[PDB]
Amino acid sequence: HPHLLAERISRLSSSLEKGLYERSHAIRLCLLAALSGESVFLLGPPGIAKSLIARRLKFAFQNARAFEYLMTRFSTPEEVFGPLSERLTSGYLPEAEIVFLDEIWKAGPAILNTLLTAINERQFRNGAHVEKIPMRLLVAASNELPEADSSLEALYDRMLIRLWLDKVQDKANFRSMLTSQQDENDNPVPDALQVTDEEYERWQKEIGEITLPDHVFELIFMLRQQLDKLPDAPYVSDRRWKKAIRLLQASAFFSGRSAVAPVDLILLKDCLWYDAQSLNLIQQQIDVLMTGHAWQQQGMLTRLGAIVQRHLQLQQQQSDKTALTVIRLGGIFSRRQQYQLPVNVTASTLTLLLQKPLKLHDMEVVHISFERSALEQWLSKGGEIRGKLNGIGFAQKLNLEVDSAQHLVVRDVSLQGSTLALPGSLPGEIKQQLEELESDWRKQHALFSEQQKCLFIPGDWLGRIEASLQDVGAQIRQAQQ
Amino acid sequence: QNARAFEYLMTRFSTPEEVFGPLSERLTSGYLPEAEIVFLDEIWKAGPAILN
Numbered sequence: 111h112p113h114l115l116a117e118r119i120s121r122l123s124s125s126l127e128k129g130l131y132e133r134s135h136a137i138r139l140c141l142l143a144a145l146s147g148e149s150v151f152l153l154g155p156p157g158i159a160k161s162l163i164a165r166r167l168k169f170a171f172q173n174a175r176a177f178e179y180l181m182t183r184f185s186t187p188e189e190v191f192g193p194l195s196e197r198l199t200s201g202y203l204p205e206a207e208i209v210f211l212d213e214i215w216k217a218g219p220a221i222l223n224t225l226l227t228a229i230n231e232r233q234f235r236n237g238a239h240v241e242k243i244p245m246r247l248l249v250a251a252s253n254e255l256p257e258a259d260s261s262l263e264a265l266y267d268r269m270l271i272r273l274w275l276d277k278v279q280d281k282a283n284f285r286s287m288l289t290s291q292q293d294e295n296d297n298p299v300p301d302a303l304q305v306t307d308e309e310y311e312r313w314q315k316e317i318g319e320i321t322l323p324d325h326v327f328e329l330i331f332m333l334r335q336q337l338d339k340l341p342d343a344p345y346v347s348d349r350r351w352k353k354a355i356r357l358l359q360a361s362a363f364f365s366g367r368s369a370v371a372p373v374d375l376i377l378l379k380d381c382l383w384y385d386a387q388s389l390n391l392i393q394q395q396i397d398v399l400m401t402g403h404a405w406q407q408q409g410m411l412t413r414l415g416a417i418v419q420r421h422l423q424l425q426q427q428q429s430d431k432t433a434l435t436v437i438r439l440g441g442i443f444s445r446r447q448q449y450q451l452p453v454n455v456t457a458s459t460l461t462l463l464l465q466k467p468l469k470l471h472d473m474e475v476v477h478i479s480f481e482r483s484a485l486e487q488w489l490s491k492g493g494e495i496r497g498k499l500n501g502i503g504f505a506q507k508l509n510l511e512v513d514s515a516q517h518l519v520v521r522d523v524s525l526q527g528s529t530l531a532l533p534g535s536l537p538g539e540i541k542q543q544l545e546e547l548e549s550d551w552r553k554q555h556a557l558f559s560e561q562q563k564c565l566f567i568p569g570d571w572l573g574r575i576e577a578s579l580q581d582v583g584a585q586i587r588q589a590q591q
Numbered sequence: 592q593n594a595r596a597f598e599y600l601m602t603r604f605s606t607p608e609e610v611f612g613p614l615s616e617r618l619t620s621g622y623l624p625e626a627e628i629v630f631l632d633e634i635w636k637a638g639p640a641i642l643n
């Protein structure tokens with residue numbers, strides 16, 4: 111039964127996208143809010159099918175009445191909700207399933223004060239007594255943004271979904287859209303896919319009963335603190351976080367799942383932002399968490415570094431078995447020219463370990479990576495040589511010299527000798543920790559391949575999650591070589 | 592030991608006949624005149640009759 115619900119939801123939105131190109135993220139987002147009792151905000155230039163989406167969602171229900179209205183600076187509440195005689199509200203707002211209000215950032219004060227009570231309570235003041243409003247979806251579109259200190263900020267804080275629609279950009283999708291014969295005022299949804307009034311009231315009870323896992327809630331446990339330490343981060347109150355749980359629980363209910371999935375957190379990119387400055391910060395902070403702390407991407411990166419550090423520690427401890435012999439050469443030269451090993455070493459940026467560690471540049475080091483292009487000139491011509499510490503930083507100058515037993519001695523500030531050595535040709539402890547970390551990467555990748563088929567997930571976001579998981583698996587495979 | 596609560600959201604459509612109780616002389620059983628702890632959320636939006 112729960113698995114068959116994802117087929118009907120995926121088939122319902124397929125018929126609604128007939129005639130609307132590059133609008134898949136706008137139709138699937140309005141469908142989730144219509145079946146859960148939420149709202150959706152649209153922002154963009156006038157002329158991007160912002161009014162057709164308000165008239166297409168009414169076809170999914172058996173008994174749904176649409177309402178299109180443009181809020182003006184001189185508009186009166188008697189034209190939106192209905193004029194009084196006791197109020198003739200036949201076919202307006204109190205008895206409408208889907209209402210559309212274009213340009214909400216310019217209405218009168220009498221309309222804005224009454225619009226805040228029709229969302230939190232879904233009631234209307236019909237003169238004396240009050241009556242419920244069966245509003246299933248509230249969509250509002252405009253073009254500009256409200257002021258930072260005005261009376262229009264109360265309605266913006268209550269709107270959960272805030273989408274930023276724009277014009278088309280693909281050339282192939284523009285030719286089919288420019289020449290479309292599909293009627294926008296017809297009914298392209300079959301009767302078998304239309305939901306009834308009994309199914310809408312039953313789904314509202316099963317949404318709040320969705321189990322909340324502890325591992326999925328760990329993402330919001332850390333992402334909430336990231337939006338508070340940065341001054342450029344938008345202010346997200348507790349009312350916005352409480353309404354985001356209803357949208358996240360309903361996203362997995364219509365996808366054939368019983369619990370909240372970590373992949374449903376991508377919908378927060380259109381709910382926390384509020385202007386053009388917060389758009390580049392919300393989409394960047396979520397992308398880091400979705401490619402870091404989501405599928406244990408960043409959790410395995412910091413754990414892999416401990417295995418590499420442990421492997422280098424065991425290599426420098428057993429360096430007394432393999433030394434470093436430097437062969438000599440004949441010829442006629444004024445200086446004692448030395449030659450390196452032939453086929454024994456062929457890498458350019460090879461690493462050389464050491465026995466007793468020293469303090470170079472007021473810091474410790476365990477391995478010094480030299481360059482094959484500069485080692486041949488120092489062993490023959492002479493002079494000074496450079497080299498970075500711990501394989502990082504700039505190539506600093508060291509006190510390298512030759513020894514009596516054909517070895518390399520590195521001195522510091524206290525004239526301390528240290529014979530260098532090269533790493534030999536995997537210990538049992540390193541292979542044990544590497545096998546356990548590789549098993550966690552395969553288990554985490556299996557969870558992403560079982561929940562990515564959700565309908566409320568954009569298509570361009572799948573290319574970044576797959577590329578991030580492949581980067582972690584490619585770094586662990588290089589250490590076991 | 593004997594404390595009666597009263598949780599009512601103060602809305603702009605609220606009337607004095609609902610917060611304190613409707614009249615018949617006023618049915619104020621379990622409202623505001625006979626309550627130990629009263630809670631009124633959002634008080635900056637009530638009417639002039641309730642504020643007075």
Ligand SMILES: Nc1ncnc2c1ncn2[C@@H]1O[C@H](COP(=O)(O)OP(=O)(O)O)[C@@H](O)[C@H]1O
Pocket residue numbers: 129130131132133155156157158159160161162277278287294
């Ligand atoms: N991006 C788009 N893709 C497909 N059709 C579109 C698009 N933008 C507009 N249209 C078509 O243009 C018609 C009129 O749209 P309109 O209601 O003026 O948009 P808006 O409400 O944004 O001004 C609609 O019937 C719709 O089919």
